[PDB]
UniProtKB/Swiss-Prot annotation, chains A, B:
Disruption phenotype: No visible phenotype under normal growth conditions. Mutant plants exhibit increased susceptibility to the rice blast fungus Magnaporthe grisea, and reduced capacity to inhibit germination and growth of lowland weeds in paddy soil, possibly due to decreased levels of momilactones and oryzalexin S. A motif (DXDD motif) lies at residues 286-289. This is Syn-copalyl diphosphate synthase, chloroplastic. It comes from Oryza sativa subsp. japonica (Rice). It is found in: Plastid, Chloroplast.
Amino acid sequence: TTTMIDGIRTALRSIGEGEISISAYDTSLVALLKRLDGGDGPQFPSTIDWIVQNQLPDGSWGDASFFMMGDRIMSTLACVVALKSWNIHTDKCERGLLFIQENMWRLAHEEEDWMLVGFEIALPSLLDMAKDLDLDIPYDEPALKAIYAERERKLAKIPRDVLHSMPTTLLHSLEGMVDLDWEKLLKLRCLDGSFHCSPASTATAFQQTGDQKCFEYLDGIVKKFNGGVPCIYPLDVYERLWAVDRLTRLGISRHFTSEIEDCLDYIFRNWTPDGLAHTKNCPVKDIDDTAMGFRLLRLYGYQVDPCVLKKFEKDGKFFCLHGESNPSSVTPMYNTYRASQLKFPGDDGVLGRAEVFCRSFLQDRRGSNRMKDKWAIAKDIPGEVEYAMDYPWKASLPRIETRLYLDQYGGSGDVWIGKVLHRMTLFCNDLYLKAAKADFSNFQKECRVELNGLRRWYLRSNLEKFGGTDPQTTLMTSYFLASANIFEANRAAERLGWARVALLADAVSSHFRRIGGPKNSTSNLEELISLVPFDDAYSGSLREAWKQWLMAWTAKESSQESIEGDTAILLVRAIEIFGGRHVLTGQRPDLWEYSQLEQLTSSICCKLSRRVLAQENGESTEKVEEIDQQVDLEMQELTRRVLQGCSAINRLTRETFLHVVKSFCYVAYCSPETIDSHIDKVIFQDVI
Amino acid sequence: TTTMIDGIRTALRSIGEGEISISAYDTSLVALLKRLDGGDGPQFPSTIDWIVQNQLPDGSWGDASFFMMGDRIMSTLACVVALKSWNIHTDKCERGLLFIQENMWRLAHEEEDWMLVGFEIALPSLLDMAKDLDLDIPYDEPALKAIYAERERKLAKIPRDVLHSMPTTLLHSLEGMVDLDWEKLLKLRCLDGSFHCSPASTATAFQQTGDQKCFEYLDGIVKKFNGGVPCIYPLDVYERLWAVDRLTRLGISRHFTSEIEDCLDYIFRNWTPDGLAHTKNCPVKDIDDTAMGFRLLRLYGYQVDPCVLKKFEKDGKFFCLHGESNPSSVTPMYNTYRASQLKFPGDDGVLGRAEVFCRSFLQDRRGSNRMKDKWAIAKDIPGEVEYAMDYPWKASLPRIETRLYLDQYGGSGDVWIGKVLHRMTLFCNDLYLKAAKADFSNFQKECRVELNGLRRWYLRSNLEKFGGTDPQTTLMTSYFLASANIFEANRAAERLGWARVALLADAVSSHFRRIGGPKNSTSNLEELISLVPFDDAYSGSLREAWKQWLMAWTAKESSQESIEGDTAILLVRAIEIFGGRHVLTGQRPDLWEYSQLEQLTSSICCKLSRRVLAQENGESTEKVEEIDQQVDLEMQELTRRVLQGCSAINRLTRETFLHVVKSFCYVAYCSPETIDSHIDKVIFQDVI
């Protein structure tokens, strides 16, 4: 119903600097800082109160929806050391210490990459702080020795001055780091004095330098939460992109266009010639957010250039980090290859290079269980990434994608890896499922009835007097092609018109093939168009377009012409007439653009038709590859012409062309045994 | 040009109580009244000044555009007696007296009915007042004895108490009357104390009774003229009707609709259940103004009832005066018979009785020179009244009437008879000629070019492959029928559409007759409609109506049906489509009215078609009279349905039906030898 939509809208108008689950680990360090003015106790007890409030039934601390030793142990350690250092509420320390001691051994049995960032860097400092309290603690553990060895390895791996000159990710986790400067390192924080926007690093920093820039930041965050802090703040750009991405993939973006373009122009104003980070001011930038923003901004008529990607290339390779070549995960390259589809022909080839590198890197590991990310856990990655690597941009239909994603969006059941298991709900909410699924279900139920309506219409016209193989399957497929490009209820007019004239042209093409052609013509077929229920105004235009199509049928005879582009042009003209829209006065650029679009469509149709023709003759595949490249070029070109926010022509008028061409390419790029499958899944196979 | 139109409009918004030429005769009597407060001189010298200003080159007084002894003599008499009674400016009396004396004899040679009202009644009192001055005056004249004898005759003809009880016209001219009461006669003046709204009677009355009601009236009129008074005042209703009558007959009423309906509702508010007079308050009412107002009010959607005419009927006769049966003139009965056309069937038969009585009274005297009125002189009455008695309401076309009237409207060259030769210019102006003629001329020049346009179109279509006798004359007549019902430039769309589909239907009817009928059908004629240049929206509706007409052609075969009403219904539908108008939601009354109109049209067409059919077979004329009555009844009925100001349907939508039916009746009620005549006169024969 609507209430979900309205709540989501109002919550979406209220985009703050961030919405993430409040962490406890960092709060514990916040408690460790005393009162500034030589006070008697800690700086802020609100954190303390928050801590006492949320003692687990097993005394632990952390998200209950999951169970992770490496994180529970650190949360418990930080809490117990904080409260007992300040020597208060010792009973809770006792309550948790039993679980601590009895769980001390489970750590040796963890997963491969489920290893928190600097996890082996804080834990040493953790037990160090502990040995001042020095309770009963089995410090004796080979796991401790292993992480110690890795500590020494990475310590021998890191420089001193490059570390003191070049701002790197290590500044995110510097508290477990020692043996440092405070002036050469002083300037390597963010615009707000935060080091990598992480509160723990800055808190430990202020512990050794009273720069008010850190105090004001922390005070603001603790004064905006009143007990509790996250592990990273803020995440404006991150959530901004990641919400609109869902709302596009969830097929509900039809309603929130205003707020959508609001966050869009925000990102645009904050766009850099160098890349993007989770926040506006973080100097170090990564590739994944950059690519995602690139894709989304292009997809809405914003002029950007992709040579910014020339920073994440590594001399014939690509690595998500700028300066670090570590084995990347699936998601960054996934979004990269995705954004690598909408290439405009006037752009540098870095996009193509990244595309081929990415597809190579992905297709191999696809067959195995390599879909495990190092920094997030979702419901089902493999299916999504597989379909993506399967159905290119030119063969993508919106409804089938949203249907597939309806079982691949996890909602709340996800977690995000950081220094602690955190989760965001602003865009990982679950009411999104209710809204989208209700919408899709009613949409299905509407398509179901209009289907039978069209069925009885088609039977009334006795069109099978010159039918095909069987009218049922083909009429189903035809109406499906229309329904898949337009799902809004208020356009069933254009929907049914499309389907009807499609069936018509099919019938007459069949009849013409069966008799040989227009030399064997006998009947007045320019009246056959009347079989469509006509309005008062929509009559004459259609008959004119129909006679035009017939004249084309005449002229295309005796030659080696194809007969497809004619049909596509007829289709777009008719869809427009049914949409009841005109063009304006027609300054020369306007009709120039129009004719350009039409010529592109006709050419593409002829080309891929001939390709299919050769495909059926067992032709040598190299020819198929040649023709595929050929259609690809003008495909890209047409897309660029449709996606220009500077166009003088209307928008819907543009996307119509896309609808038709995508329909044709799709139906020309799959066996029916998949088409019917998709058909039943989207129509008859019901949700909820 | 426009300036004439704007001046006429602004002058028309300024309708005063009256606009008539200022008389001098009555002013002379006004001068005769002394100062009220025992003053030293006359009451108002402004009249005197006015008099001295306008001494004629022959010393006389009166309109110079005409020369009438009976009036010049009285004006001169009144002036000389006034000025010399007050013994001032005697030289002017001498200057005029020579012409007076030398003209004293011409009076014996006047016209039959060119005899002013009470002319023989004031002249005796005139010479009576003179014999006090008693200058050289040949009182000896047999003409004086004749008018004296008639004085005595009428004095023996008039009663005393009926004259003292019943307000009659004699109260208009009572100054030459003596031997009277002043109380029984006191109440027989108008609402304003004026006796018959004439200033002379009231002035002589105040001379013998100082009723302020007369003083204020006269003061107002002399204070609103500052020297000079008319012979009758005011004339609000008179001019109100007589201006809009012209503006309707002059074919320019298209522009002044606001002010038109303003004066209309004025007359309506002042409408009585008893009749009308020249002014609002005159108790005695006459028939001519009543009938004229009746006609004009009905012609604009105002509900009135005609039993008010039962007052002017004289036991099987009609006489313009209520109570006096004197030999009437042409004009009153003329307007009466005119108003007697738009009879609604639900009305009493007094209209029909008056119609037959009037036509009988008129047709006889038509052949002679009986078109002389007793109270006005115009340019050419006979032609106008003849055409009126020739072309009934059902056979009246607006353009031919306005063209004929363009040579029958005299403009300023007219005079109006009263106690003195007076003239009004508010509605007898001459700039009306400039405006109307310029309009008509440009209209002609537009029709001339669109004619050649349609000619070349008709030739382009090769329609003569199944032509008629000769395309030229018939296509001319067809386009003429359209142009004669619509002359506004902005409707050439509907004009040309009408003409084109008329030619079409003619062609196909011819082809069908020539082959025998739809059994011998061979070609797809429901495509023949495409030969008309179609717009984007106006296409489908026309093809639908065309196929409807064809289906009618099919069904009407093998029967004794006619094939005309179908054509008329097709015509109105097509004219409407070209006009680009719809009906509203269609509450039941709406479509009820619609269907009613359509059924009426079809029936009338069939009936008069069959009548013409019998007419060509030398059928017995009584059958023709029977069928004529038959069409007449439903003709009246249809007219009543069109002329209801209470209709829920639009106006133009209504008058369209009238246009078509009037076209059909007209073309069915005249030899072509008159049609072509009218055609050349209206199109090629140019004005100015």
